[PDB]
Symmetry: D2
Subunit: 431 residues, 4 copies
């Protein structure tokens, strides 16, 4: 089988080790019960993490056979930039978008840590994501995709485990009992692309961003917090974000880190979404992604000045589709690769230019300038009145056909046959 | 022919009379040259219009055989609400949307004024839209659609006319010469759904919202302008917006007028778009639509809590498609009616509920509450760990197929065959 | 729970009783083991069924508390006609289509039999579909959709059951042992809309239609079988198929039965498809649907003469999407209803006319005539050379933008910069 | 201007010279009137053309300054194969498809002949396509795309020309008068990918394929014509068609020529389509494309055995969209390149395998075998009954939401609240 319901005694088990209580207690438990756990910690540039190096040490202290720190920032930022280039975001509300930051983190974490484990001769994976969420499924697909012989063991869904220790307090009393010493209004996941806040009090639709203490930006909704308007420039070269406020970077990680600081000072990008889980039930989250939002705005502004209507519609439609696949843990499936590759090659390749913005609070900003060697937009941009008259006349054929259709629809009752207005009246409950 | 290149002497000609210099001079000229012009003015609830009644009088004074004021507010608001229900908006940049307010105005104006003219035995139409824009084509389609025998005469594209008087000063000197007495950094069109600002200085991408004196809201970008945060509630009943801040209205026109005041105090909805004209060339505009934006945000928030993923994706895809048809002057074509009707019946019908927002400046706002008897979202909402294990296992078949595809793509060079990362590397210029 | 793993002793259990060995043995077993089974047989107009009345009698003989025959033909044909109107078919190969006949049968069977059971105070359902196929899931969704308190019991996935009797021979020896007396190269499912043939020898891609003994048509691939060319006319009225060869019918069931005879004499509609199961693994089937195919061809021919390009594209795109939802057992989900309703109202409503065809063997036929009061097509159908010149000239703006894009793509290596042909060369493995 | 209304005396004019009466008379006339015409003939592998070499000679005899024969077969076949790989076909009726053969011919002809002309210092183009069709616009876009300074001169839309000689007889009397010596039920255009038949008697929907004398295949509808069943194998390697009946070819042109012979003996691929012109009016045509059809069938059969559901849906949707762009003369526009490139790279690259078919008459054939190293389909292809039970159970959340929606739709009147059937009844004219 793929999913082992019980602890594989004596077997080498890889654990995606975050360092929290859940994985610490599970690691200690798996060792105590006879398994040989190996710890793998992903450096994802978590904004509230200042000492990634201490994590593998705690894993060793708790029983890990070996513990490694895998740096995933470069790959994370590369995929985040690809998402920006593809507009691979689908959970939107009134124009505010969730930038699929956790989905991106799992795609890189799931593949890189499993590759690292297979490299160390480890073919069993364990991660603390619960059986009720999206993550459990994302890690599942990316892992089996990377290692065909990968088997999954999640002690948290093992009777023997859940039996004795099953709650937070249960795990804490367990650590104490094992000889080792050692709560918000919501849970937070984060990486350098963004932070998500969900569960607990955020489960209630009457809670709001007001109970959140943002970790990548300021509380822009608090009028007492001072936020000076700020001018910012964002420049792209062939789809690559290369300069912020005229400064370049040694690598994309440093660029994204700076994008985060700029948007962070304003709270740019924060949204509140009710979304659909992979298991077709809804969930609610409050999200942060200051740098992604900054790049996304500049990218789209350039896009509107550089590409034609049909190409921009493909960016939107293929982008939304890709966003859903990314969210489902299918970022590397053939249908996703095809959409991503096509958008990167034909849309992003031409995105060269610079956008100037004035940022104030949250999502309030203004566009101040747009420049590009590739613009198809031109001020006061060729044809005569007579050329237009002919073009207008060529429309008569189709207008006549449409007029006949309206007559036919009125006849069959879809449009009111009695409309002393001139405005066709569609016959449904709303009109 | 349909488009008459020269003035039809002695013939009754209908003129969409706005009251501006252009149509005033044209009316006087057409009468002077032998035609029998009839004036029709549409009451569209233009925000900067306080005396619609005086317009037909000026038409009479300038030579109109008869002049009528056609009230189009009810139809305008009805179509605007339908657009909200259908998310019929397509020009977006970073989540900021143009609400197709001029397109909606033309659809109602073009049909209603032509119906009024045909009613008075008038079968020739003239309107001052230039031969370089979208409007000329919108009025053309809606008119011929409403009156099969409609012929078009636009003096502004008549040699005899353009010859003598051809400029603004030319027309002004013409009025004076005819015995009658009588400039911004951009041109403005507006109706009660919104205001558009384009041309002149706005043709330059280095101009911005800063040179605009908004007519439906405040200058939220001016830090010296004081804008108190404000809580607002918006309630829908079966897709119909029925209450604002707990108050109902005698009709939808009054509701929209109030929505405008609420969003106006904050500058909600304002955007800057580079878009594609019907003639496939780009144009730039700065837009206002405070009430539409307010309703749009609340509607979408409810939508995310009430409908499933596939239904919401149809709202987005069909909505964007509909927005483009609306923009092209095809709001009543069969393909548009089908999308609009389907969305009104199956999506809007279930949109019942109330959304509470906190508005600050421009597009900076927060969602404070979302309630609905039709929510499918439920706090802490059924299945066991074992149920999930089986569901996860059912994925293996497709994961194996995908793994084989990745192998095949690496083999054919689409993915790097040499990737010591674990993260598949797509082979294109961006990666 | 929803799915009962073990027999609910003493409880009333509803069984979708087909009369085959599987359900006969299961019914006898469930009674013998203490449950109180009720039998429900759906009359679906199975082509190879001549005595539906005897089925409930055999159920009574085997232990059914009560047995009913539910006529589902009218609903089946109504849904089949809706599918035709919506082009709700998605498994196609070289233009040959699977008409989703089993999916349609399950939607009507699953809802109607469950309603019948709930009517008799029965709230547990059992059906013999295996745990490896699509059907098990289709019946599951339609049942719970119709009865919220419905619980599922499938003895075939019950250890106690599978234990003792688990094979065909096991069940046969069981009947004998219980006091009652009593194999092709593939399995067949069928209803009056079509017949499916799959499994066994058809699992192999080197098998073909040659091993199939069609039950709704002749062996058109056998040159020794004589098939006279035949002229046939098909007439629709507002989307409803009303006449075949000039004759009308007392109801749609009789019309479909005649459509089947006409197409059957030729083998019209037969296809061989490799498709994707709901569980994302592939399956292979050989299908028959002579009447559906006949109506589908005539409907589409009229569609091409009556509706415009955008409307026809929506028919194809929304139709394919709907076909997939139908196949998944989601024919009544909101996203499906929206697509189906929109197509029926705006596309089908205008389909009035008659198509004449000459049928020969299999899918070889010719179109001989197409007539319709609603045609927008007209022989030698308005504009001048000068009108076209202007229209062509209006294209220059976009052509220039496209030329600049080609230059940009060549520059970035997507198109060959070295092409002494004039034909742009896309840079990928295929060119 | 771009389109010259009158003959540019003394100027070098390039003429796409087919050799027919129309271009022969125009060439002679343009020389006689003072222009300096250059002739360019495209070798497109026209099936009914046995002496392409004589064409430029006749051009020289009629006054051409120089005349060249440009071989376009290789490029034509390359683009035709790309279309097959992308399923770039959109005019379909009952599964029968028009393979966009003229659109492909114009894309190669328009670009290659203009490049040849610009090469000879010729910057004015003339072609005999009428102002009422699609071709005039296709040649227009491909030409200006290839040569920015290209100007168009079509004598057929020149008053001076149309004045004196305007009809066929007029042109014939003209040739005689100039010292040179020298009708079906429809017009035919053709190249090695296919033949189109339209106009004249085919304008009437009561005409049929029976009045057509096919030029690429036999009259399969004539029962007296003997057509022996034939087995054929088609093999692809990474999307490239490489073998037919086990034989390979020196180049793709020879392969396509053989594909044509094979399908031609049976009349495979012939269809009758009512379609929409670029100018939104309908037209009718009868088409031949035996080789394209043969490759298309084999390609799709392999596609169904190799790619997953989402990837196949993209092939269909993106393919149909691409087909429309191709038809409009936009085969090289950015939105087309993006769709074509994505499909070639991610779908076609994996199409390796062989399909065996039995061809009889017209579109009647059977699939006999399908093999591929890349198949994801496998006979008797992993999961247990318990795994399926859990997977089925995970559906309850969404089923409950859907049940609530049905209740809501019944409440708002979209579904009958009174349905003693169990089958939800959609409330519209069709049900
Ligand atoms: N930086 C990291 N390195 C390695 N593994 C990690 C890292 N961050 C998270 N994980 C793994 O992912 C699991 C889930 O993450 P986390 O506990 O933060 O999520 P959550 O908010 O509880 O949501 P869910 O349970 O749905 O995943 C952790 O138990 C751990 O196995
Ligand atoms: N309220 C109205 N009632 C009747 N006709 C109107 C009204 N508003 C505008 N029109 C008609 O529409 C024409 C175009 O409107 P307007 O002059 O405001 O547009 P514009 O900004 O110049 O842009 P364009 O020229 O592209 O339309 C006017 O010349 C007039 O004929
Ligand atoms: N006419 C009918 N009336 C009632 N129930 C039926 C009828 N036809 C089929 N069924 C039910 O559907 C079940 C599955 O049908 P059948 O055995 O014909 O399918 P199959 O070819 O074995 O494929 P699968 O197992 O995937 O359904 C039967 O066991 C029976 O419960
Ligand atoms: N092989 C060729 N080489 C060069 N030019 C060609 C060739 N075939 C066709 N053309 C050009 O295309 C024009 C149109 O082709 P043709 O006359 O065959 O089309 P048609 O059936 O009359 O339809 P339409 O007028 O709509 O193009 C010809 O007048 C000629 O200029």
């Amino acid at each position: 089988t793929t999913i082992l319901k019980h602890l594989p005694v004596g077997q080498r088990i890889g654990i995606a080790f975050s360092g929290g209580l859940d994985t610490s207690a599970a690691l200690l438990w798996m060792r105590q019960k006879g398994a040989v756990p190996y710890a793998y910690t992903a450096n994802l540039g978590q904004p509230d993490e200042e000492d990634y190096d201490a994590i593998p040490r705690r894993a060793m202290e708790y029983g890990a056979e070996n513990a490694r720190l895998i740096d995933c920032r470069k790959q994370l930022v590369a995929e985040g930039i690809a998402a920006i280039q593809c507009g691979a975001f689908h959970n939107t509300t009134g124009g505010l978008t969730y930038f699929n930051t956790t989905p991106l983190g799992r795609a890189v974490t799931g593949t890189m840590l499993v590759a690292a484990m297979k490299e160390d001769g480890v073919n069993i994976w364990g991660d603390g994501s619960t059986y009720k969420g999206n993550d459990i499924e994302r890690f599942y697909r990316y892992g089996l995709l990377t290692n065909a012989e990968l088997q999954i063991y999640k002690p948290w869904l093992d009777t023997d485990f859940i039996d004795e220790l099953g709650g937070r307090h249960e795990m804490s009393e367990f650590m104490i009992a094992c000889g080792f010493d050692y709560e918000k209004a919501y849970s937070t996941d984060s990486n350098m692309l963004g932070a998500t806040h969900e569960a607990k009090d955020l489960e209630y639709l009457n809670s709001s961003v007001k109970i959140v203490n943002p970790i990548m930006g300021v509380k822009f909704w608090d009028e007492s917090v001072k936020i000076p308007a700020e001018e910012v420039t964002v420049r792209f070269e062939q789809g690559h974000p290369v300069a912020l406020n005229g400064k370049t970077f040694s690598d994309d990680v440093e660029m994204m880190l700076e994008a985060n600081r700029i948007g962070g000072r304003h709270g740019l990008g924060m949204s509140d979404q009710i979304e659909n889980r992979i298991i077709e039930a809804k969930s609610r989250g409050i999200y942060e992604a200051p740098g992604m939002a900054l790049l996304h705005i500049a990218y789209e502004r350039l896009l509107t000045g550089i590409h034609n209507e049909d190409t921009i519609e493909q960016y939107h439609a293929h982008g939304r589709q890709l966003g859903r696949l990314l969210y489902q843990g299918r970022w590397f499936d053939s249908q996703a690769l095809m959409l991503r590759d096509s958008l990167q090659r034909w849309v992003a390749s031409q995105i060269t230019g610079e956008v100037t913005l004035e940022l104030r609070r949250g999502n309030d900003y203004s566009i101040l300038n747009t420049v590009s060697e590739n613009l198809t937009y031109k001020p006061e941009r060729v044809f005569s009145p007579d050329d237009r008259i002919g073009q207008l006349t060529m429309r008569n054929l189709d207008i006549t056909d449409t007029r006949e259709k309206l007559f036919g629809y009125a006849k069959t009752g879809l449009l009111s046959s009695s409309a002393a207005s001139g405005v066709p009246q569609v016959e449904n409950l709303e009109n």
